[PDB]
Amino acid sequence: LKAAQKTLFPLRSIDDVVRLFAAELGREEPDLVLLSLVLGFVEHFLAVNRVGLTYFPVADLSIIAALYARFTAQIRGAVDLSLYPREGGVSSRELVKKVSDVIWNSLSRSYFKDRAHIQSLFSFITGTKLDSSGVAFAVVGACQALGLRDVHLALSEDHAWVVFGPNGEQTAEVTWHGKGNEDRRGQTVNAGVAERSWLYLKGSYMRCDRKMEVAFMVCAINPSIDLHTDSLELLQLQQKLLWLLYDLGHLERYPMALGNLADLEELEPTPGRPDPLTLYHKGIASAKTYYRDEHIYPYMYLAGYHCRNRNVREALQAWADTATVIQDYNYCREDEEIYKEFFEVANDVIPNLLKEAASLLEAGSQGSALQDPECFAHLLRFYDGICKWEEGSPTPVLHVGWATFLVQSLGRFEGQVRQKVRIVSPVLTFQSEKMKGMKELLVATKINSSAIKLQLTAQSQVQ
Template sequence: MSTVTRSASASPCMALNGIIDASLFPLKSTSDVVNLFRRALTSAIEPDLTLLSIVVGYIELSLTTGEAAQAAQAAQAALGGSNEVIMGNSVPFPVVTHELIAGLYKKFQTILSVVDKPKPHRQATREIIKKVSDVIWNSLIRSSYKDRAHLQNLYSYLSGNKLDCFGVALATTAGCQLLGYRDVRLAISEDHAWVVFGQKHVESIEVTWHGKGSEDKRGQDISAGIESGSWLYLGGLAVICERGMEVAAICVALNISLSANSDCVEVAELQQQLLWLLYDLGHLKRYPMALGLLGELEEINRTHRSITCEQLFREAIESSRNYYHNHHVYPHIFQGNYYNRLLKYREAFAAWANAADVIRLYTYQCRDDEEIYKELLDIANELIPYVMKTESSGHSARSILRDAEVFANLLRFYDGICQWEEDSLTPILHIGWAKPLVTNITKFDYDIRSQVVIKLPEDVEAEQAAALEAKKKATAAATAAATAAALEASLHAEGNNNNNNTVVKKDEKSKSELPTTLADLTAACGEKILNPDFLLQGGGQPFADQKQQAVADQTTSSELSHNNNNHINNNTSSSNNAEKEATTISNNGNNEANSNSNSNSNNNEQQQQQQQQQQHKEAKVEEISQVELASSKQPAVVDDYDPFEIMLKRPVITLYSQKMKGLKDLLLAEKLNTHAISLQVTAQSVASRKVRGSGTDSRQPATISATITAIASTEGASIGGSATSAASTDSFAPTRPKRTRRE
């Protein structure tokens, strides 16, 4: 194969025409590989998926399945057990030569030569993509290799014709790119992969199979899977990759396993550095699974100074919430298992409950949901019982068994699983689930269980209706207050244009009987302060309390009398509005008769006093208006509101599943009827069909008020004989941290 050597500083590292830059080879270290990826991701030409997958695939298989890896496994076995860690065993980094990569690249081009290349600016069609996947599918070895590890890269395909389901999807995407179809993109859920195409990437096509069966789905649209409510397709909210994210998928697919109990440190280090490169370039922002995997690697071996694994787990959750409407389950499982490893059991229970809140959005499909089923079964039957057993010893006041919120999160966890089971053709909660559930519930005393406030959806709907009605009333009251303020301001501006006698007449009118007609009420709004009780409830006087008005008038009269050297005995208990009005008018008349200069001075002082009173009224009306507007924004207070409950911070949850709603009284009973609880949990589900959409479920999961400061990684014990180890599964979900590592 002919090659062209270019300057490494003046050209991209490769071109999508089979001509590979030989100046970057050989690759002799992890840093060389990272530099190759950096050049591919930052050059003007889009990254070549074929080249990058061949490179990392060769390194992965050389270090995990080659002679050096076999020698390392033999040495580990000689140490006598999977719990031992091999120290100081250095595996030489494989040298990646230009001839090796160019030869395999050429081979892939030859395989795809039967597919027509596109005309200029032509987009891919379903038939073209199906033909590419047919070529790859028909060249695979028909054997059990698809259930083994290290089969997710193009090196495995080109050197041994072996691929798992994700490998086929990746090979199809890379093949379409190599042919020149730029609109074909890889789509990834948490346990499956397919292809999207078209100008807006809205068309989809299956190009592989899923699970352990041999039947393929190639050529089908994924709409049927979305409509079935299967977790496998994430409700249509899977990760749709750009080229940089497809490179991230290649890195996530790296399998660092040497065996079921040990990892290859060299491959883990390469994967960690490549993911940090992609993180810094912004390609992991919309990829929750990659963020979670990077968090796991940092948990085992921290390499970044400023970003911790907890921050990465938090970003994984935020990515799922911001870009995928919180439809991804694994980020929450990452969080719960991570906290569990740190012995932060309260946070772990909250995170596991959040994972169940996501899974409730789907309907259980037996074969498609096998991987997530095993994860949740592991949590329910292995991790939680172990925590309960640990915490029950000693039973201190700081134990989670004395925390009502932990009990509420436990109920929320099982409520999500029960709702996941509803409408499924296959039941989930058999007796193997029921026994640990009953045992876990009995660990909590009645005084702790009784603190949890359990509500049903119909209760929530009634509260929401009451809150809406209260908001409407508050809005109407605020509108009335604002209207009154506007009327008073208008009348005040009109009054300023009149003489002092007009002001006095206005005071006379204000002391008259309260208006009863709508016209009088409207006119008096400019003179009186509206009574909030009258506006909100319709009772009492239309205007402010008369005693307050009497005190204000008395103060004004006293000040005027003092300024005019007229000492009048003001007895507030016996005086009334009429007497004070007459006194005010008489004093003004006497002042006017005594001296013209004194009259002018008194008029000015009186006008200032009136203006101050008017400004006070305006400020008071504005204050009332602001209070009403603020009250309209506050949540409505329901009839059963208990301040003591808020003081104790009693956890409140809403149970949505039919099974858990039936357990409400049993869970809060002083003496638990374990037999009745077990029967209810294992009963056949009779729930109505869930309403699903392209975004979120119509019923939003309940949440518990809890402060969560970190996001977690996936870890858990194996589920007896039914669990499949990370080294022997075709799932491309991130592997859990292994119990032993070779260093």
């Protein structure tokens, strides 16, 4: 550590931690290793072990510098740079693989790999444990510790790797994904980009600079103490650090960080700041501007906010928008997280929303989503995008499980509402062949349940 990095210690409060992040973010290269160790230290003493806590776990320079020394010793001793000569100020694939193997080989042989609080360099040093994306971040922190200015974190919506090399144009796998998936460590991500899977976002993934890597570690703070309790101290810290980053411009290219900040503001708004809705919309604008509108979660964050607020119309619209993104992907093997999310929206969340709407309609509600043909159009657009996603994918998406809920959800709208949607080859155009074939069935007084099931699952025959 440099003398100027040490002058704010000891850190005695949330605001002292924010001052350290501001100071580092004002430097040429914010120090990822220092900042991750500080966040892991404070998270450990606020969420993992609160014994003796009276306000804030003071981070003394001696403690943090010792952890920093342990990390830098471990990386510098194990990775000999002279063996990997650097042309043009850029790293080689062999060097990036070496750093990734050093981190990997340091981890405990066996542990629950999706526990909370194993994301930071504090966990790596004190517990020899990291989660999947934590391994990728630790490789980028180790590379910065080694002076490898070209190695940066790459992020999709469900995975992490690194970019490096001439023009930052190379990619390398550095960590595992999911469970059971054989890992492709050391390889490029080009096969996954070429197959048009959600996991690699058709190439529209995030290439972080160092300030975005700071934003990633801030998003990675986990305030959870247990299943029903969060640390208010860590929530406040994360929220303040996200605002710092926002004010400096470093969330411009980071949709998920904007959604996380909107979620925090919903929980506890900061006076004089944008509303959660404005922030969800900025996340969607960011995805449109920098990522070809190929991200799913900007719309999912928005839908979840409208869902929690029972804005049924706007929740349906946002989930329809989610499906309009997914329709231009191929459902591939390791995309199971987004499949689980769409399955839960179609087969649990929407049905529960519409069941409540049906009860409130019975009680005299006006302006109900169930009487709005634009809402029925959003429900149809959601299923259309799911059906179009399925087209040209290796694995199928839909099955009879889904058909039961579709028939139920359609039946929540009276025929006189359903009949007002105009399906053009509210006005809606279908992209999927499944929904085009379903058109006549959708606007019938009594829903033909068996015919709908046949059309959605392309089941050839009946009993």
